[PDB]
Amino acid sequence: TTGERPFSDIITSVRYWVIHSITIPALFIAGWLFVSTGLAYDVFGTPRPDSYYAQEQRSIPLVTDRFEAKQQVETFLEQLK
Amino acid sequence: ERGWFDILDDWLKRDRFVFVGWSGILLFPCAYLALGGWLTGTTFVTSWYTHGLASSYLEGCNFLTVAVSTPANSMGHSLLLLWGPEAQGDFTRWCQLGGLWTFIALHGAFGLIGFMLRQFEIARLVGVRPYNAIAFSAPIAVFVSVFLIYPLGQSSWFFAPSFGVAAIFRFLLFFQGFHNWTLNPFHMMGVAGVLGGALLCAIHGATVENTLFQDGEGASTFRAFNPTQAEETYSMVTANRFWSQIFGIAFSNKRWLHFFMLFVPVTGLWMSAIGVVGLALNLRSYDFISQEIRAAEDPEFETFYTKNLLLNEGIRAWMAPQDQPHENFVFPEEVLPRGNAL
Amino acid sequence: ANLWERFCNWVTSTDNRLYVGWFGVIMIPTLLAATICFVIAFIAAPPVDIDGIREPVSGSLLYGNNIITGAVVPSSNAIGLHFYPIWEAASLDEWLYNGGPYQLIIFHFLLGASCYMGRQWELSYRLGMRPWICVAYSAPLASAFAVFLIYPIGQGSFSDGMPLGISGTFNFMIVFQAEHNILMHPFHQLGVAGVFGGALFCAMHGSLVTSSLIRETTETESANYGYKFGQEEETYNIVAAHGYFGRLIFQYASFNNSRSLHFFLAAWPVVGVWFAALGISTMAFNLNGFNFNHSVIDAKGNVINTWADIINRANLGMEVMHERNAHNFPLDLA
Amino acid sequence: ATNRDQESSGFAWWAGNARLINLSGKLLGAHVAHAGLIVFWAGAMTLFELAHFIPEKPMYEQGLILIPHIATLGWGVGPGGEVVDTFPFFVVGVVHLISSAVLGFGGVYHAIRGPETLEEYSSFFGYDWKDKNKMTTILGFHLIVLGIGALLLVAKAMFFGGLYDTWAPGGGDVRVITNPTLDPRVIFGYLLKSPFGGEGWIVSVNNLEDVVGGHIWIGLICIAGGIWHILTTPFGWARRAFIWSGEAYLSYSLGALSMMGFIATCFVWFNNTVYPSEFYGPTGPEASQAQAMTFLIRDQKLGANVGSAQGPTGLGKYLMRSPTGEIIFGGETMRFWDFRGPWLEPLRGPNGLDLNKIKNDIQPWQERRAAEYMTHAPLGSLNSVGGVATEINSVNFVSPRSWLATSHFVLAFFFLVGHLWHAGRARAAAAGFEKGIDRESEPVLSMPSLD
Amino acid sequence: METLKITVYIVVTFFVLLFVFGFLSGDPARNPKRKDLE
Amino acid sequence: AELTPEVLTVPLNSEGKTITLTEKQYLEGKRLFQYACASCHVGGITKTNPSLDLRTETLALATPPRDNIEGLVDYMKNPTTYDGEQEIAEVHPSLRSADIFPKMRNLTEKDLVAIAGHILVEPKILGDKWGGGKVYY
Ligand code: CLA
Ligand code: CLA
Ligand code: CLA
Ligand code: CLA
Ligand code: CLA
Numbered sequence A: 001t002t003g004e005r006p007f008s009d010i011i012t013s014v015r016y017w018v019i020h021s022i023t024i025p026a027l028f029i030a031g032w033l034f035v036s037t038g039l040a041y042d043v044f045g046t047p048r049p050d051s052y053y054a055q056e057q058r059s060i061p062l063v064t065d066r067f068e069a070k071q072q073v074e075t076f077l078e079q080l081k
Numbered sequence B: 001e002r003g004w005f006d007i008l009d010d011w012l013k014r015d016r017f018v019f020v021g022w023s024g025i026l027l028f029p030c031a032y033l034a035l036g037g038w039l040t041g042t043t044f045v046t047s048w049y050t051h052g053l054a055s056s057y058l059e060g061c062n063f064l065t066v067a068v069s070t071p072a073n074s075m076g077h078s079l080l081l082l083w084g085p086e087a088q089g090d091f092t093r094w095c096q097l098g099g100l101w102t103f104i105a106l107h108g109a110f111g112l113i114g115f116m117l118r119q120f121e122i123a124r125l126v127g128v129r130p131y132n133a134i135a136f137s138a139p140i141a142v143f144v145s146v147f148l149i150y151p152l153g154q155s156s157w158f159f160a161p162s163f164g165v166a167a168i169f170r171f172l173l174f175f176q177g178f179h180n181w182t183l184n185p186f187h188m189m190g191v192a193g194v195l196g197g198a199l200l201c202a203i204h205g206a207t208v209e210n211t212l213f214q215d216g217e218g219a220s221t222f223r224a225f226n227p228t229q230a231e232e233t234y235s236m237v238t239a240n241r242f243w244s245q246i247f248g249i250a251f252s253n254k255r256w257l258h259f260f261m262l263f264v265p266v267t268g269l270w271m272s273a274i275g276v277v278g279l280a281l282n283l284r285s286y287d288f289i290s291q292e293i294r295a296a297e298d299p300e301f302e303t304f305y306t307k308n309l310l311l312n313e314g315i316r317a318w319m320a321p322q323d324q325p326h327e328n329f330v331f332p333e334e335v336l337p338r339g340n341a342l
Numbered sequence C: 001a002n003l004w005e006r007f008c009n010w011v012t013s014t015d016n017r018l019y020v021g022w023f024g025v026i027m028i029p030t031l032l033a034a035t036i037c038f039v040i041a042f043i044a045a046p047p048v049d050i051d052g053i054r055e056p057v058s059g060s061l062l063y064g065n066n067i068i069t070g071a072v073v074p075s076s077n078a079i080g081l082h083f084y085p086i087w088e089a090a091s092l093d094e095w096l097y098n099g100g101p102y103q104l105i106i107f108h109f110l111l112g113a114s115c116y117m118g119r120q121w122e123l124s125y126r127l128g129m130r131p132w133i134c135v136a137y138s139a140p141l142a143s144a145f146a147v148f149l150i151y152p153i154g155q156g157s158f159s160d161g162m163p164l165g166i167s168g169t170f171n172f173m174i175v176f177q178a179e180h181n182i183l184m185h186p187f188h189q190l191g192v193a194g195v196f197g198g199a200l201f202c203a204m205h206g207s208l209v210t211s212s213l214i215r216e217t218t219e220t221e222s223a224n225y226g227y228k229f230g231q232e233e234e235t236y237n238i239v240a241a242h243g244y245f246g247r248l249i250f251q252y253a254s255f256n257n258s259r260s261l262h263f264f265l266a267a268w269p270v271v272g273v274w275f276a277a278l279g280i281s282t283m284a285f286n287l288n289g290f291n292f293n294h295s296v297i298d299a300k301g302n303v304i305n306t307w308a309d310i311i312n313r314a315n316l317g318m319e320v321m322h323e324r325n326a327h328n329f330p331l332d333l334a
Numbered sequence D: 001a002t003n004r005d006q007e008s009s010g011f012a013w014w015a016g017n018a019r020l021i022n023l024s025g026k027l028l029g030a031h032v033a034h035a036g037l038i039v040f041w042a043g044a045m046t047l048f049e050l051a052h053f054i055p056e057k058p059m060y061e062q063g064l065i066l067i068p069h070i071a072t073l074g075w076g077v078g079p080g081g082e083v084v085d086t087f088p089f090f091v092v093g094v095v096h097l098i099s100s101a102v103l104g105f106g107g108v109y110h111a112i113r114g115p116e117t118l119e120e121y122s123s124f125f126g127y128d129w130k131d132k133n134k135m136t137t138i139l140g141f142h143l144i145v146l147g148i149g150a151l152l153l154v155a156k157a158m159f160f161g162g163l164y165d166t167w168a169p170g171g172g173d174v175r176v177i178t179n180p181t182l183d184p185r186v187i188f189g190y191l192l193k194s195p196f197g198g199e200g201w202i203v204s205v206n207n208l209e210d211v212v213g214g215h216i217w218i219g220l221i222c223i224a225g226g227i228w229h230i231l232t233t234p235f236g237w238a239r240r241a242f243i244w245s246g247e248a249y250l251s252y253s254l255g256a257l258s259m260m261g262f263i264a265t266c267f268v269w270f271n272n273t274v275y276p277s278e279f280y281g282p283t284g285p286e287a288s289q290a291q292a293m294t295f296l297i298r299d300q301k302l303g304a305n306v307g308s309a310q311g312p313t314g315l316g317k318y319l320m321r322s323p324t325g326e327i328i329f330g331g332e333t334m335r336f337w338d339f340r341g342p343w344l345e346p347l348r349g350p351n352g353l354d355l356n357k358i359k360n361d362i363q364p365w366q367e368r369r370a371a372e373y374m375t376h377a378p379l380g381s382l383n384s385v386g387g388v389a390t391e392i393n394s395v396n397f398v399s400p401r402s403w404l405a406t407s408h409f410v411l412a413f414f415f416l417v418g419h420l421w422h423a424g425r426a427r428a429a430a431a432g433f434e435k436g437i438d439r440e441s442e443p444v445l446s447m448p449s450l451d
Numbered sequence E: 001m002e003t004l005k006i007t008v009y010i011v012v013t014f015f016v017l018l019f020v021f022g023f024l025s026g027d028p029a030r031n032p033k034r035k036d037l038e
Numbered sequence F: 001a002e003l004t005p006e007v008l009t010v011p012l013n014s015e016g017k018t019i020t021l022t023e024k025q026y027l028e029g030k031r032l033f034q035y036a037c038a039s040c041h042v043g044g045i046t047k048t049n050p051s052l053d054l055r056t057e058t059l060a061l062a063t064p065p066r067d068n069i070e071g072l073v074d075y076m077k078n079p080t081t082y083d084g085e086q087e088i089a090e091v092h093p094s095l096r097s098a099d100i101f102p103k104m105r106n107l108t109e110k111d112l113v114a115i116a117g118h119i120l121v122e123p124k125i126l127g128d129k130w131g132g133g134k135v136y137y
């Protein structure tokens, strides 16, 4: 043994569960709301189901330049009306 | 001298639940970020703008189809730093441009360095020979040759493997269609090392478990072993006779047996790495010239070699337009190679 | 001691350089027949009409093959699963054109290798060993049954059995991928875990035991001379190896019991290869890998491609090109 | 805690059911409790199938494996296999469900409440694995029970409605079997057929007269042998060839079950008589034939002479000869010419497929059947996408024949492993070295060197 | 061909009978420890 | 892109009248088409006769024209060959032959409209994918 309290000691202690019956559901709900509020879409730049194409377009908005790639994507994003 | 360096050395080598060490300063941040970036990307990040692919749980992919895909072919071999000229410090564009792929690949590379330094560092502290670190050179040679050297020989990072289950499957199939990689004798040696390694693993473990000495009374024989016991727990003499009579030859030297188990998979992975270094340059073992000369002139000559090239030609023509979108391949129906009816 | 008793004592004798035994009585003649026929056919056999469309494929060295392209070619699709011994042909020349040798080899081989497993059980009983080495060998043995017998039965023809050759093996694997999407099947995935894992644990166990060898030699001699065949004492320090590997990860991720360590080394690759053989064996009845073709759709109904759709593009190219002259109707149902 | 820990019993918890080997009262309960689970699944799965069952979809479009078994026995179905009354299905499921409560009650009683050993309680119900006489008697009782079971199928076939006959003139129907085959040349002739293509061993039985007649023989055989094994005790040649222990008898059964599982796998894959295609979907051979039939019909209506149409290889595009001359469908289905089915046989003459029947006698119900079977080929993905591996999502279909064949191949395989495991161990335990080599008595050290 | 067929038929029956009578000839007693398994 | 009322507006008959479907009808059309028709028509092709597909251009050139709701509804009652010359209810699922194609037994008039709408709307979404076969997968 290396000194730390045994894991079976901690996870059968009442205090562990007093703390973690809050903290575990709380993180879960924070993860839920990150998606449910739409925030994950905008953090990572992921398209919503109505944002992959324009209404009539069937072309992929593929990046084709290295140093204007950022403007290419912003331009593609405007073109969604 | 007990200066700050020596004090810090003491704390870094405390015998705790997770050993740290000097090597841990490199290993833990890089291994954690490589992992977290893969989890972040497969959960939240698209491949729409680089590949035309959905690739995250958020888009509706599952564990088999998510990936952190490679950057677009127009990025070349750009390091794709967050603060680089492409993303210009924009975290969202960085993700949409494939920045997570270099992030994972680069932090992964330095994490593996860290892990091998940890094997050296822990072995030096405990007093064993560093053969475990020497064996780990093979995974590093595979990683470096497939994820870094291969795409550096090609046009861009786009053709490196993507970090995902089905994405890797596509890599296998691309290597068959374009590189005829099954024909490559360096892959063949790799296959022999991996399969022979699996064989050695099963046969050694089966042999030990079935030549045990009866060192206890219970029907569960696991209990009858003590880590500090001096005697061997199974009979090498009986093991050797059985295999001599079953198979003709047998191990008799236990040190040789275990060195050979190190040797076989390690060597195979090194051999496969060399082949991939060739494929970085399209230096393939694609054809046998004598077969082609005969087949060109003699339309009755057919081998499994000519049969498989027909398959490769199908793979190339049918997957290329969607697998390489930046190329804008437009193949009309009439040019697609097809057999009768299908 | 009458003659039958003498013969039985010689067959079952633990003093023969190679153990014969009762399985050996079936094993030896069947393996010789398969080996001799294989060698001759690989060198000199004429081309074989594998797919039944009067389009013979050349497999032997004398007819234009090297070691990599050569094969014993599976028997004709016109034969299907019919039994085709030499005596059912009007001539040897007919037998060879239709791929008779393939049947003779695999049927003799599968019997021989099955008796080889029996022989592994049998000698262990004669030596007072525990009996389960043969169980480890059932995983490669089951795999051979899968590609030589089970898959033909489910597809209805030995012409879809694996060819006896190196490039022939690759043909089998590529057509399998196109018709079953084996890469997307969880039993092939467990098989990959089995053999990647088995190779990992092989190098691991080898490196750990080699790392903890007890100093018994000088720097100018091989360390292998520090172990003597039959010595009573262990040749390495398993406490040292556990103390190293336990700190590489954490203490409870390392084995201290050699017996359970070696059991794990047996079990992991054997179980994984069992699943891989069950993959081939159940795709033999067209229960194929996961199909996510066009699974992701946008708000309008546009297909959003995933990596699974790219795989499908590659599978289509294999599908449309394989056996290019053998299909007349639009669906390849077997 | 009798033999309920490792110190006392010698067995770790992960081999804990081995602690039951010599505790016949608790071993009885574990067997009865397990049978309750089998019956439980049968009744419950049947109810689930019924609840999800739409009478106007084909059974094989609905993931049914149990209702097809009930229907083959003559219940719920009329001409063509059309479902006319789902209440028999309901009854079968309910009665199995209720019975499982009786078995579970007995299993849990004998397992945790009744006497742990039956020998001190009853000399009839008690037994010694080593008692060759008692063991063949217990075996004798169960052979008589199994024989009654086989006669019940005959009773249903001959006296209680009959069986569904896919071959019945008209399109298939329930039919009373009035003259089951009794000629032992026929019944045991099936036993001696080759298992290879065109022969098919017992999988080839293609009429209910043979099926019913074979169960009459099996019924008598089992009842005869059961009386034989009650009245006798193993002969000396049998005493010397077998291990006589509980694990050994377990290992023999495991070998038997594996063999049966493989046979069952081939039965459901090839046989369309006792697994009617109306209920289970077409066999793999059947759907492939049905594709060729379909396109011969399409192109002949467009004006093609199918007898003389040379395909790209030089073989006929639609028709060709089998290796023994028979006229058969062309293309890759040449491998399937051994297929026989009620929709195809009217086109068959003495030389195989008959060009004049093909030109003049193809009825629309055959065009329908061939198109149905061609489009329900037993091909599909693990997530139940029907079709070839390259097909797109749309059709939610995997054939019952694929489900049944794959499941039972996997089970049969692992039961062969179990045979090897337990037969090897049984041998070693009888001989006294199943726990390891005796250090001071190692056999190999008393043997001369090989060289 | 007919001679070939009978020859193989005879060779195979020969070896199969050895196998069967072999394992019938007291095989459980052919072990190094307890030699009484009836 | 999304499923707008414009996408869902389709020709009701040949005289040029349109009708606008709800998203509910369209999804009902998709489900019922999977139930009764996709075993042969998955993706707009025809597995038992690949010469005839369900592309709107092909349906326009059928006799009588099938490129509208009325033509498609009529076809599911009394199907004909492409030239209109022969009635093929005996070999093609239809209400007239619901006794030999039992899956048609529980299709109502309103179901036929929804299946029709799905056939007319899908090519507007998938373009060449619809009726294109494996080349466009
Ligand atoms: C079909 C599956 C099955 C069955 C029928 C059994 C049966 C048995 N096991 Mg085994 N076992 C099994 C699977 C099974 N096991 C598995 C999967 C494992 C791995 C974990 C084991 C590991 C194991 C060990 C290590 C041991 C056993 C033992 C036993 C026996 C005594 C159990 C006992 O006394 O507990 C008492 C348990 C309780 C009092 C709790 C409740 C148990 C009841 C019976 C559950 C009933 C619930 C049910 C819904 C009630 C319906 C009633 C209703 C119909 C009226 C009993 C005959 C023991 C033995 O061999 O003794 C000699 C023993 O030591 N088992
Ligand atoms: C009728 C069949 C049968 C019977 C009565 C037995 C009986 C026995 N077996 Mg044997 N065995 C069998 C078939 C059978 N076996 C088969 C088919 C195999 C091949 C795999 C084996 C392989 C085997 C081994 C290797 C061993 C035994 C052992 C034993 C003994 C102890 C078993 C125990 O307590 O396990 C306890 C039960 C468990 C721990 C449960 C295991 C859980 C399984 C693997 C899960 C399977 C997954 C499931 C199907 C699907 C997932 C479900 C999930 C999603 C919820 C007991 C005499 C032991 C022995 O030798 O004693 C003499 C032993 O070491 N058996
Ligand atoms: C004889 C065995 C058998 C067979 C052939 C079938 C077949 C079927 N079932 Mg049924 N069923 C069974 C047993 C069986 N079932 C059991 C035991 C249960 C209780 C759980 C059920 C409860 C059930 C329900 C609730 C449903 C079905 C449904 C179905 C249909 C679709 C199946 C599917 O999509 O699976 C998906 C594929 C898998 C789940 C793959 C499982 C992989 C396993 C876990 C691997 C394990 C291998 C081995 C056992 C372990 C060995 C371990 C080793 C170490 C020894 C199909 C006809 C569906 C249907 O359509 O009904 C109308 C449905 O809804 N079944
Ligand atoms: C086949 C499995 C089986 C076997 C071998 C036994 C054997 C035994 N039981 Mg158990 N038992 C079982 C199943 C079994 N039982 C079931 C399913 C239940 C729940 C109903 C019980 C509930 C039970 C209780 C409460 C008791 C026993 C007792 C006994 C012992 C004395 C029985 C006796 O002499 O009755 C005399 C014989 C009869 C009364 C004949 C019964 C005929 C049956 C009921 C008619 C139908 C039989 C026919 C085959 C039906 C086939 C159904 C099948 C196909 C599903 C004996 C060891 C006694 C005991 O343990 O004493 C300490 C005891 O008190 N059993
Ligand atoms: C559950 C079924 C069952 C079981 C487990 C037993 C078990 C036994 N029987 Mg019994 N028997 C049974 C049913 C059963 N019997 C039935 C239904 C009958 C009436 C037909 C008999 C009539 C009977 C007689 C007359 C005798 C036995 C005897 C025995 C004992 C010797 C077994 C043996 O050595 O076989 C091994 C089998 C052989 C040696 C012959 C097979 C030859 C080789 C292996 C080729 C066959 C393999 C091949 C692949 C099979 C494919 C199919 C084939 C038809 C072509 C053993 C305890 C013997 C005994 O001791 O009685 C007291 C004995 O003399 N039984």
Ligand code: HEC
Binding pocket: D371, D372, D375, F033, F036, F037, F038, F039, F040, F041, F046, F048, F049, F052, F053, F054, F055, F058, F059, F062, F066, F072, F075, F076, F080, F081, F082, F088, F092, F093, F115
């Ligand atoms: C296989 C048994 C089929 C099923 C199920 C369905 N259809 Fe079908 N369809 C099938 C064939 C062989 C043909 C060609 C018939 C001919 O000889 O002309 C068709 C044709 C159609 C058409 C006409 C297509 C055209 O371009 O004119 C339509 C509109 C059509 N089928 C619709 C349809 C519907 C709505 C179905 C479900 C109720 C359906 N089909 C099922 C084969 C099969």
Ligand SMILES: CC1=C(/C=C/C(C)=C/C=C/C(C)=C/C=C/C=C(C)/C=C/C=C(C)/C=C/C2=C(C)CCCC2(C)C)C(C)(C)CCC1
Binding pocket: B032, B033, B035, B036, B037, B038, B039, B040
């Ligand atoms: C990228 C990046 C970064 C990082 C981040 C991170 C670090 C993250 C992490 C993250 C994480 C850390 C995540 C995690 C996740 C996890 C999960 C999501 C899990 C899941 C699981 C499951 C699902 C399970 C399953 C299973 C198995 C596996 C087996 C057993 C059984 C079961 C089934 C249970 C930074 C900021 C620096 C910068 C920017 C970029």
Ligand SMILES: CC1=C(/C=C/C(C)=C/C=C/C(C)=C/C=C/C=C(C)/C=C/C=C(C)/C=C/C2=C(C)CCCC2(C)C)C(C)(C)CCC1
Binding pocket: D029, D030, D033, D034, D036, D037, D040, D094, D097, D098, D100, D101, D103, D104, D105, D107, D108, D111
């Ligand atoms: C011994 C043992 C064991 C086992 C046990 C078992 C196995 C048991 C079984 C049991 C059983 C086997 C039971 C059963 C029961 C049943 C029941 C309880 C039923 C009921 C039913 C009902 C109630 C019904 C109802 C109904 C009707 C009538 C009509 C229709 C509808 C419905 C469904 C509603 C274990 C492993 C745990 C371990 C320990 C030991």
Ligand SMILES: CC1=C(/C=C/C(C)=C/C=C/C(C)=C/C=C/C=C(C)/C=C/C=C(C)/C=C/C2=C(C)CCCC2(C)C)C(C)(C)CCC1
Binding pocket: D186, D187, D188, D190, D191, D202, D205, D210, D211, D212, D213, D214, D215, D217, D218, D241, E019, E020, E021, E023, E024
């Ligand atoms: C019902 C029916 C039928 C009939 C059937 C029959 C009649 C059957 C019989 C069957 C039989 C009658 C079988 C038998 C079997 C047997 C076996 C399977 C055996 C085995 C053996 C063994 C296993 C042995 C072994 C050994 C050896 C070899 C050596 C010595 C030692 C020992 C003993 C180990 C038919 C088809 C008509 C139709 C359908 C229905």
Ligand SMILES: CCCCCCCCCCCCO[C@@H]1O[C@H](CO)[C@@H](O[C@H]2O[C@H](CO)[C@@H](O)[C@H](O)[C@H]2O)[C@H](O)[C@H]1O
Binding pocket: C004, C005, C008, D237, D240, E020, E021, E024, E025, E026, E027, E029
């Ligand atoms: C198609 C397969 C047909 C198989 C038919 C099987 C029928 C069974 C009838 C009994 C036949 C067994 O006949 C068997 O033969 C030999 C003599 O040749 C006997 O003799 C044996 O005795 C002992 C047995 O412990 C052995 O050590 C000895 O090596 C051997 O000679 C066996 O004790 C006898 O059991």
Ligand SMILES: CCCCCCCS[C@@H]1O[C@H](CO)[C@@H](O)[C@H](O)[C@H]1O
Binding pocket: D075, D159, D160, D161
């Ligand atoms: C073992 C439970 C038996 C319950 C009773 C089953 C009767 S079965 C019944 O028998 C009739 C003949 O009289 C047939 O006409 C009818 O179709 C059939 O269902």
Ligand code: OEX
Binding pocket: C051, C077, C155, C159, C160, C175, C179, C322, C323, C326, C332, C333, C334, D332
């Ligand atoms: O032979 Mn060899 O490969 Ca199984 O699919 Mn059909 O057949 Mn042929 O085609 Mn694809």
Ligand SMILES: [Ca+2]
Binding pocket: D132, D133, D134, D136, D137, D229, D230, D231, D232, D233
């Ligand atoms: Ca008796």
Ligand SMILES: [Cl-]
Binding pocket: B307, C171, C175, C321, C322, C323, C324
């Ligand atoms: Cl091919």
Ligand SMILES: [Cl-]
Binding pocket: C326, C327, C328, C329, D330, D331, D332, D333
């Ligand atoms: Cl074809």
